[PDB]
Amino acid sequence: DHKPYHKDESHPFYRYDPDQCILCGRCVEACQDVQVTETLTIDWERKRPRVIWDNDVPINESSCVSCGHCSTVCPCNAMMEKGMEGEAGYLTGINNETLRPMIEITKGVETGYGSILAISDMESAMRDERIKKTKTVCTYCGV
Amino acid sequence: AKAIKRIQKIEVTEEDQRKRDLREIEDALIDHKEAILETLHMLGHMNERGVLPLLRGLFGQ
Numbered sequence: 001d002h003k004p005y006h007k008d009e010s011h012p013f014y015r016y017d018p019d020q021c022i023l024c025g026r027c028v029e030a031c032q033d034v035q036v037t038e039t040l041t042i043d044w045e046r047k048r049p050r051v052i053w054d055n056d057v058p059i060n061e062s063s064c065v066s067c068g069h070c071s072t073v074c075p076c077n078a079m080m081e082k083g084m085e086g087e088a089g090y091l092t093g094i095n096n097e098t099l100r101p102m103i104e105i106t107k108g109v110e111t112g113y114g115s116i117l118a119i120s121d122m123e124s125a126m127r128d129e130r131i132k133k134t135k136t137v138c139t140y141c142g143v
Numbered sequence: 144a145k146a147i148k149r150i151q152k153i154e155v156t157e158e159d160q161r162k163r164d165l166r167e168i169e170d171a172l173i174d175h176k177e178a179i180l181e182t183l184h185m186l187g188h189m190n191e192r193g194v195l196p197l198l199r200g201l202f203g204q
């Protein structure tokens with residue numbers, strides 16, 4: 001079921017997809033007790049509880065330190081760094097105007113998750129060809 | 144102007160014969176220049192639309 005809230009691309013570094021949010025609160029636990037900035041909260045009193053910023057203020061206007069913990073600790077694409085959007089895979093480049101029907105057609109036809117998930121694992125495996133992950137030490141502060 | 148039958152073959156060197164054989168390909172390249180540029184454009188479009196990287200990933204992984 002689609003959540004009645006909009007995606008917040010206000011922040012130049014990360015986005016929030018409410019329709020993909022699973023209210024795990026990993027981001028909320030990180031911002032308050034790990035980063036200890038206390039921007040991220042979840043309004044449970046609402047009909048559809050969602051991850052809020054301050055008093056449901058857009059991320060750019062909010063007290064966001066922009067550390068990026070929330071995106072590190074999120075388990076799915078709900079909290080994601082904007083640098084990956086339409087860049088990670090091969091089929092991800094497709095415009096959302098054509099990719100959204102592409103998804104609806106897939107749901108209608110599919111039988112079980114087992115089969116389509118296996119196909120997705122193949123795109124994920126093909127991703128090793130183009131994406132490289134290299135360990136580095138930050139050239140900013142002496143931390 | 145006596146009667147003779149011996150024949151002496153000309154010295155087509157290793158690189159000489161090579162340059163003639165290469166010119167053979169270079170001629171068919173010119174003869175099909177039209178289709179060559181057309182295919183290259185099409186191929187550039189396949190990379191443009193991720194078709195080529197999609198296949199590269201497929202074989203690489």
Ligand code: SF4
Binds near residue numbers: 023025073078
């Ligand atoms: S970490 Fe991401 S997916 Fe999990 S509750 Fe927070 S916003 Fe939703």
Ligand code: SF4
Binds near residue numbers: 035066068
């Ligand atoms: S980057 Fe922003 S949303 Fe993420 S933990 Fe830091 S202040 Fe909270």
